[PDB]
Amino acid sequence: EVGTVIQVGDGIARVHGLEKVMAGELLEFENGVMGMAQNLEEDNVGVVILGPYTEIREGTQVKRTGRIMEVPVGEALLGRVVNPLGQPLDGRGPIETAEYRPIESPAPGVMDRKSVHEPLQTGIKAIDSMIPIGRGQRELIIGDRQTGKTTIAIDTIINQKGQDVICIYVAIGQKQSTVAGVVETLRQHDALDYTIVVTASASEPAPLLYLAPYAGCAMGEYFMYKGKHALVVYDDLSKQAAAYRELSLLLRRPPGREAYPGDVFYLHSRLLERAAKLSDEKGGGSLTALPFIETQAGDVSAYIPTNVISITDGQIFLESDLFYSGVRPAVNVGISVSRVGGAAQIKAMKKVAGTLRLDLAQYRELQAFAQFGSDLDKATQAKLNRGERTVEILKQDEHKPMPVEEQVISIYAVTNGFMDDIPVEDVRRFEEELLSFMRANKDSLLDHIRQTGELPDTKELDAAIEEFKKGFTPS
Amino acid sequence: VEVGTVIQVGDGIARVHGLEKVMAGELLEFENGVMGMAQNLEEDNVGVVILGPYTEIREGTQVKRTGRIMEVPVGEALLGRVVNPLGQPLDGRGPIETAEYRPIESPAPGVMDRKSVHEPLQTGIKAIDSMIPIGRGQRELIIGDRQTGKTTIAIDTIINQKGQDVICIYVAIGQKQSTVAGVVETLRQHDALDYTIVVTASASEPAPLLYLAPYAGCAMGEYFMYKGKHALVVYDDLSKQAAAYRELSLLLRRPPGREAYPGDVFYLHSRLLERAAKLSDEKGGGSLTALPFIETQAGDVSAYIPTNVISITDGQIFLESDLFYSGVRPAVNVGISVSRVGGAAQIKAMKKVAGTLRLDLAQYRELQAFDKATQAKLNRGERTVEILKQDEHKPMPVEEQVISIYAVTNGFMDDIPVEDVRRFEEELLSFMRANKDSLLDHIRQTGELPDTKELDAAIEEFKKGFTPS
Amino acid sequence: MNKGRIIQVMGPVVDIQFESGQLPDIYNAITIERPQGGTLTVEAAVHLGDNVVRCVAMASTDGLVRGLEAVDTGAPISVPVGKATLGRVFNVLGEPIDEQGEVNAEERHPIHRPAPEFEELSTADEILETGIKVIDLLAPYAKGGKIGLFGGAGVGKTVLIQELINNVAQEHGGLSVFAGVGERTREGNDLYHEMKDSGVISKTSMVFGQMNEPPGARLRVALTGLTMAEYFRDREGQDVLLFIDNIFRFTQAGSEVSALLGRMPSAVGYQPTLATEMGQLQERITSTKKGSITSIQAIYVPADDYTDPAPATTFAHLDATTNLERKLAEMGIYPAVDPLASTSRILSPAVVGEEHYRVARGVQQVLQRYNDLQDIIAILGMDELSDEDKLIVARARKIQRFLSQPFHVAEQFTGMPGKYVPVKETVRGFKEILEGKHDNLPEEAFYMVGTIDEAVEKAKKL
Ligand SMILES: Nc1ncnc2c1ncn2[C@@H]1O[C@H](COP(=O)(O)OP(=O)(O)O)[C@@H](O)[C@H]1O
Ligand SMILES: Nc1ncnc2c1ncn2[C@@H]1O[C@H](COP(=O)(O)OP(=O)(O)O)[C@@H](O)[C@H]1O
Ligand SMILES: Nc1ncnc2c1ncn2[C@@H]1O[C@H](COP(=O)(O)OP(=O)(O)O)[C@@H](O)[C@H]1O
Ligand SMILES: [Mg+2]
Ligand SMILES: [Mg+2]
């Protein structure tokens, strides 16, 4: 029941007694600060402290709770900013809820699932067309700093507006004023009222960074097991991994590659497998995961990147070269993968995207001939003209996610050759005015894609685009 | 009997209490028959490396002294037998009945105990015997990538010692047991098994047995050397042994260095291959020839373990991967392969005929990656390449080799097309064996080349009967 | 039997103290009853001293308490074997995870054991006829052999695995085992249903060591599948198939366990027992006098570096490689096996005949020449090629289509019924194309057929 502290240092306390304590049990110090039993040793209990430790000393007493760590869950957390313990940080009162869930919770088994068949639209043309994410899938967003990782997750969250999908943005190890900037961006785009924000900033103790993704996962699981659909973002697991390394090294567990312990893979695999697509018997709900990894100088073969790449169902690789050139979002399509693939797309997108991935592969493969202008044969001439125009369609502005019906028409137009006549610099303006024309006048073609999930009459669609093309003025 | 008790054990390394009078490096036996090695004698305890399966050894398990320094059985009882590094039979043909034993660790011959290597050890392989000749008592490294023909050189060398009164020892370290079973079956079919000892420590066998395997095979070869006879030892391979010794050293928490290997990894191989030698007339005149294997990664001869064994052996035979997977087998790299003994390991006829053959082919391969004078050398080069190509498990007598090399180097195959050279060789030797047997027999008895004029006529006589494509 | 107390719990490691003179052997399964229901199994690893045994956990250690009873089972992790395992999905401990009722096997065998003795082993290489033309001709599988399976996402990896199970079961009567080392739970569910739909479920026992299990579980799961494969070889004399996906994750698990136990790392941060662990797994996969286990193994290559210790140690045991290429799948050439990049140790006049080797090499030389001329043809044109090359290009295109084949498992995709083509028919078919007997036939005739007779039969319909 009760035990006394032997030694204290660096957010860690070793405790005498507590003979019947569980591994992972919640503990309470005499001043009200909480702790978690990580190491059970022969003569002491290694406890990680979930708060300040300056008032914890030798002779300080610790109490058993007899419980694992739980968090508040449900509709009350929507629109709120919380820490990993579920305590509010936004300064907008308490979180009234009867529903609670454990931080550590087992993932759905092999028989509890159904194949991922439902789209989770990011609203980003490059991702939705060629690297499609499905409901229940785990898709890694990976790349160096300032490549556009966070923006992709925020634009995905904004695009869920009016789609009945609860979003969860987990911030781990970030500057707290940067997190304050993120919630303001969600507020301005009307995205916050269906979003839960879990933040464990850089000044927080290491156990809260370690526990932040699991806390956010539990909040997403509530909606999954109730039959609804949810999205969780871990931004990022690199800083979470480093926080768990800190605690393991302080508890003197043996170091390996980059000083990480032997259970750091187990850490992330246990987290990410809880994201799933449930079967009809289990209610049919889902949790989609978007884990982040911050690589260093493009080193995808570093240890923590290697772990999370293999665990997930696919990777959206971002790169600095593309970002600086103006290809934004800076998605490397060649190496990026989605193992779910066509199953996560509607029939309209699946049909148009086949030519898009073919055309874009041949362009960047035959880009050595690009400087040699007008010396080439007409076969490779038109493919370069087509290729550079499709790149301009795959470019997209910040915080402007496109509906799937508008994406497929834009991809249909460029791939079938309706923008070959228009110059390269006017392709993005041609897109914006075309979709404005289609929304106002030819809404029946758009509404067909919304309702059926298929392309309308192709010759009717060709006629609609050609009417606009005559009204357009190049430059 | 003097007993001890295990107090700690993990990864096949035990700490034993008792064994007060035990020697350093002594053979020990546990309750269940598994053997052990007393490595370190500590103040109150003994460090014991288990030389077998350790899934029935634990704290409380008892172990006894044998009173013997780490040793193996030796002699004629092991001929045609398959054993592990302890000398225990794996073939299932009953026990090894022998009174003779020799220690695993044993000193090499001194400075005055040796004599310069002057006696041929014929491999029966044209490329090796002509360009990189091996002698009795020499140490010749066989080095190259995975699947470049290393084991085939050793087995064909062993097969070629039939009727030559040379005992052979094939030490398999860390190989698949499938291949060792295939090797012994190949030796049975070619009647090479009855003078061959097979020591095997497979990839499933624990690391200390891989570590000990070469020294056990060395001891078995040493028995015959010091009694006046000649022996051949093959270590296939020392890269597996080095990696196995690294495991043992890392389990013992000894400080690692380059590629995580311990500081005595050079000494692992250097003391092994020093024991291979050519003894003097005072010491009986016997010898032990060593063919250690090293398996490189991507042809990198400059790596730590490859450079260690190059620094020990008397030259090396590098097997090129690009040549091996483009028809050229055996794929001997003439540029960097060399025999230190050289001409002293060849008979007079082979030395004279193939005197500059290595540098001529080294020049040819340089000119290939690039006139009328040099065009003749390219045409001659292509034809000599076809002669040095050879099928596996088909050794050639030295008298037949020298005739074949004599013909191509003096220009008796220039008018013949390149694709017909392999058939030209085969049919020329049938003509030479059947009809002109006195020319071949002159080389067998004396060692010297026959009459130049008489041999030239015999080749030209055959060329009239031959028909090209 | 022996009973002990938990003294320490440190992540997935558990130290258990036993009474004097009655300790568990190394690799013994030790069961611990959880305070909140269920049973944790741990594996004995190190004997530390003072009758304390350090153990590696096969499941989560959360909820454990110091002082709980731990029971020594008296043997390693023992798993069910025989026909009761067929059509079922298992975990590392041999327990069913498919929720499909009881597994009524007669025997349970331990997953830890030595490799077969020298006297038991086969002494010569024998081809394992898969019935798939491209594999049998150009990169044939050996009985007791190990094959490296390479290929990207969505190229026909799972379809090829299912076809090998079907063909060996149908013609050779050899059953299969699938070992998912680090299986993603989503993909394990898909694979189960995919094998149900194709019908090969009944010929295969499945074992998953899932991504979200501890390193100990993923380390030993290949041994569980291996033990099931060994029963059918040793008892029923079968030529068994053993699929391991992914073999790198087996090595990865060993490195993780080694780090937990506190061993000094080796080169490139790998465990010092790298070769030993790989060898003790791989040597058990072999051809005996009674039967064999042939293993198709998916291999991840870290940093695309084949000299890395993980793939380098794995490649020491491989007898062949099946390299799937995406460009062939895009052309419609299924199975999408790269006929130049795929290789085999047993492609020689010794194992297969002199004719097989001659025809196989002829196919390679023709396809290599066609591959070299792609840049010349694309720019300069067909008139640039000599009269010799024009014929080689024509035969290469026929050869490339005759290497394709309709699969029993892929009847839904192709439409046509599947075909098993014997080796002799495969050798004869490609021989006749190289000799020029079928030069006048159209190229569509060679596409998606079994024997050479079916190509001639297709020509009249075109
Ligand atoms: N599609 C885009 N177009 C223009 N600017 C962008 C786009 N995506 C991101 N940015 C900008 O580039 C920067 C990229 O940083 P960020 O999105 O935080 O990625 P990371 O999280 O990898 O640093 C941000 O300041 C953002 O405003
Ligand atoms: N001279 C040769 N002619 C034909 N085949 C050969 C020759 N030498 C070796 N081989 C074959 O090539 C393969 C590789 O030879 P091997 O000696 O096993 O190489 P390593 O031991 O270096 O892996 C074997 O299958 C062997 O049968
Ligand atoms: N033998 C085949 N014949 C026809 N189509 C095939 C064949 N193999 C694969 N495919 C096609 O490729 C797709 C992916 O196959 P799959 O085995 O799932 O690849 P992977 O396991 O590499 O993801 C299938 O859905 C099918 O359409
Ligand atoms: Mg960011
Ligand atoms: Mg070999």
Cβ distance A60 to A30 under 8 Å? Answer: yes
List the domain range (segments joined by +) for residue C418.
347-462
Backbone dihedral region for residue A291 (phi beyond 0: left; psi -120 to 50: alpha; all else: beta): beta
Judge if C97 and C67 occupy the same domain.
no
Please state, in angstroms and rounded to a whole number, the distance separating the CA atoms of residues B41 and B26: 10
After what residues is chain A interrupted, C–N > 2.5 A? none
Question: Can you list the pairs that C74-77 forms with residues at least 24 positions away whose Cβ atoms lie under 8 Å?
Answer: C74/C1, C74/C2, C74/C24, C74/C28, C75/C28, C75/C29, C75/C110, C76/C27, C76/C28, C76/C29, C76/C43, C76/C110, C76/C111, C76/C112, C77/C29, C77/C41, C77/C43, C77/C110, C77/C111, C77/C112, C77/C220, C77/C224
Please state, in angstroms and rounded to a whole number, the distance separating the CA atoms of residues B155 and C257: 40
CA distance to partner chain B, nearest, from residue C93 (Å): 19
Please state, in angstroms and rounded to a whole number, the distance separating the CA atoms of residues B331 and B385: 10
CA distance to partner chain C, nearest, from residue A34 (Å): 18
Judge if C297 and C381 occupy the same domain.
no
Judge if A395 and A462 occupy the same domain.
yes
Cβ distance B287 to B281 under 8 Å? Answer: no
Judge if B332 and B391 occupy the same domain.
no
Q: Note which residues in 292-351 of chain C have CB less than 8 A from chain B.
A: 306-307, 312, 315-317, 345, 350
Judge if C156 and C23 occupy the same domain.
no
Please state, in angstroms and rounded to a whole number, the distance separating the CA atoms of residues A209 and B293: 52
Cβ distance A356 to A411 under 8 Å? Answer: yes
Pocket flag, ligand 2, residue B296 (CB < 6 Å): no
Cβ distance A341 to C154 under 8 Å? Answer: yes
Which secondary-structure segment (H or E) carries C376?
helix C374-379
Judge if C186 and C289 occupy the same domain.
yes
B16: domain CATH number? 2.40.30.20
Burial of A263 (0-12, 13-18, 19+ CB in 10 A): buried
Main-chain dihedrals φ then ψ at residue B387, nearest 5 degrees: -70, -45
B376: domain CATH number? 1.20.150.20
Tokens of B26: 């002594």
- For ligand 3, atom 26, the nearest C-alpha belongs to C413
Judge if A372 and A403 occupy the same domain.
yes
Q: Note which residues in 50-89 of chain C have CB less than 8 A from chain B.
A: 51, 54
Amino acid at A472: F
Tokens of A64: 């058993």
Please list every protein residue whose CB sits less than 6 Å from any atom of ligand 1. A 143, 145-151, 328-329, 396-398
Main-chain dihedrals φ then ψ at residue A389, nearest 5 degrees: -75, -40
Q: Note which residues in 360-389 of chain A have CB less than 8 A from chain C.
A: 377
Judge if C392 and C326 occupy the same domain.
no
Ligand 4 centroid to Cα of residue A77, in Å, is 23
Please state, in angstroms and rounded to a whole number, the distance separating the CA atoms of residues B415 and A25: 90
Judge if B80 and B162 occupy the same domain.
yes
Q: Looking only at Cα atoms, what is the longest distance across chain A? A: 85
Tokens of B400: 């037949």
* Helix intervals (H) in B278-336: 304-310, 321-324
Please state, in angstroms and rounded to a whole number, the distance separating the CA atoms of residues C46 and C48: 6
Which secondary-structure segment (H or E) carries B168?
strand B166-173
Please report the DSSP string for B26-43 in residue order.
EEEEETTS-EEEEEEE-S
Which residues of chain B make contact with C27, given a CB cutoff of 8 A? 55
Cβ-Cβ contacts under 8 Å for A149 (sequence gap 6 or more) = A141, A142, A143, A235, A236, A292, A294, A318
Judge if B380 and B447 occupy the same domain.
yes
Which residues of chain B make contact with C121, given a CB cutoff of 8 A? 177-178, 181
For B242, name the nearest residue in chain C, comparing CA atoms only. Answer: C275
Degrees, nearest 5: CA angle B213-B218-B220: 100
Judge if B161 and B251 occupy the same domain.
yes
The packing angle between helices C423-435 and C387-402, to 10°, is 160
List the domain range (segments joined by +) for residue B140.
69-346
Please state, in angstroms and rounded to a whole number, the distance separating the CA atoms of residues C258 and C268: 14
Please state, in angstroms and rounded to a whole number, the distance separating the CA atoms of residues A269 and A136: 15
Judge if A267 and A138 occupy the same domain.
yes
Cβ distance C269 to C202 under 8 Å? Answer: no
* Helix intervals (H) in C199-300: 215-234, 247-261, 274-282
The packing angle between helices A237-250 and A303-311, to 10°, is 120
Tokens of B2: 């003097």
For A301, name the nearest residue in chain C, comparing CA atoms only. Answer: C303
Which residue, of C29, C58, C76, is where some domain finishes?
Answer: C76
Please state, in angstroms and rounded to a whole number, the distance separating the CA atoms of residues C154 and A343: 12
Q: Which of C266, C306, C358, C365 to mutate to test the interface with B (most CBs of B within 10 A)?
A: C266
Main-chain dihedrals φ then ψ at residue B243, nearest 5 degrees: -65, -35
Judge if A364 and A417 occupy the same domain.
yes
Radius of gyration of chain A (CA): 25
CA atoms within 13 A on the CB side of C441: 26
Nearest to A217 by CA among A90, A91, A108: A108
Please state, in angstroms and rounded to a whole number, the distance separating the CA atoms of residues A74 and A91: 19
B203·C282 Cβ contact <8 A: yes
Residue A144 assigned ligand-binding role: yes
Judge if C218 and C267 occupy the same domain.
yes
For C65, name the nearest residue in chain A, comparing CA atoms only. Answer: A22
Please state, in angstroms and rounded to a whole number, the distance separating the CA atoms of residues A224 and A222: 6
Judge if A43 and A91 occupy the same domain.
no
E-assigned strands of A295-440? 314-317, 337-338
Judge if C275 and C212 occupy the same domain.
yes
Tokens of C132: 């798939």
HEC string for C34-99: CCCCCEEEEEEEEEEECCEEEEEECCCCCCCECCCEEEECCCCCEEECCHHHCCCEECCCCCECCC
C14: domain CATH number? 2.40.10.170
Main-chain dihedrals φ then ψ at residue B257, nearest 5 degrees: -130, -125
Residue in the structure block whose two tokens are 């005992």: B167
A294 alpha carbon, closest ligand: 1
Judge if C234 and C352 occupy the same domain.
no
A273·C97 Cβ contact <8 A: no
CA distance to partner chain B, nearest, from residue C257 (Å): 13
Which residue, of B326, B346, B366, is where some domain finishes?
Answer: B346
Residue B151 assigned ligand-binding role: yes
Helix (H, G, I), strand (E, B) or coil at A189: coil
Say if C13 is an interface residue toward chain B (CB within 8 Å): no
Cβ-Cβ contacts under 8 Å for A319 (sequence gap 6 or more) = A143, A144, A147, A298, A330, A332
Judge if A138 and A155 occupy the same domain.
yes
Which residue, of B68, B92, B116, is where some domain finishes?
Answer: B68
Nearest to A337 by CA among A124, A118, A144, A139: A139
| CA-based torsion, A22, A24, A26, A29: positive or negative | positive
C412: domain CATH number? 1.10.1140.10
Judge if C335 and C354 occupy the same domain.
no
Experimental technique for the deposited model:
X-ray
Helix (H, G, I), strand (E, B) or coil at B196: strand
- For ligand 3, atom 23, the nearest C-alpha belongs to C154
E-assigned strands of A285-385? 286-294, 314-317, 337-338
CA C82 vs. chain centroid, Å, equals 20
A197: domain CATH number? 3.40.50.300
Please state, in angstroms and rounded to a whole number, the distance separating the CA atoms of residues C384 and C391: 13
Nearest to A385 by CA among A369, A397, A407: A369
Judge if A110 and A230 occupy the same domain.
yes
Judge if C338 and C366 occupy the same domain.
no
Q: Which of the residues B15, B114, B271, B340 is marked catalytic?
A: B340
Radius of gyration of chain B (CA): 25
Judge if C177 and C116 occupy the same domain.
yes
Please state, in angstroms and rounded to a whole number, the distance separating the CA atoms of residues B30 and B34: 6
Residue in the structure block whose two tokens are 């899934």: B55
Could you tell me whether strands B287-295 and B230-236 are parallel, antiparallel, or unpaired per DSSP bridges? Answer: parallel
B126 alpha carbon, closest ligand: 2
Nearest to C102 by CA among C94, C110, C113, C112: C94
Helix (H, G, I), strand (E, B) or coil at C142: strand
Which residue, of A67, A100, A122, is where some domain finishes?
Answer: A67
Residue in the structure block whose two tokens are 């911030």: A171
Please state, in angstroms and rounded to a whole number, the distance separating the CA atoms of residues C91 and C98: 10
Q: Which of B59, B241, B259 to mutate to test the interface with C (most CBs of C within 10 A)?
A: B59
Closest residue to C153, CB basis, from A42, A273, A339: A339
Helix (H, G, I), strand (E, B) or coil at C149: strand
Please state, in angstroms and rounded to a whole number, the distance separating the CA atoms of residues A137 and A151: 20
What's A134's DSSP letter?
B
Burial of B234 (0-12, 13-18, 19+ CB in 10 A): buried
Q: Which of the residues C43, C163, C183, C277 is marked catalytic?
A: C183
Binding residues of C for ATP: 151-158
C253: domain CATH number? 3.40.50.300
Cβ distance C65 to C26 under 8 Å? Answer: no
Which residue, of C76, C104, C124, is where some domain finishes?
Answer: C76
Q: Which of B8, B9, B55 to mutate to test the interface with C (most CBs of C within 10 A)?
A: B55
Total domains in chain B come to 3
Total domains in chain C come to 3
Judge if B313 and B188 occupy the same domain.
yes
Report in angstroms the alpha-carbon separations of C320 from C136, C141, C145, C341: 11, 7, 8, 11
Cβ distance A78 to A193 under 8 Å? Answer: yes
Which residue, of C76, C97, C129, is where some domain finishes?
Answer: C76
Residue A459 assigned ligand-binding role: no
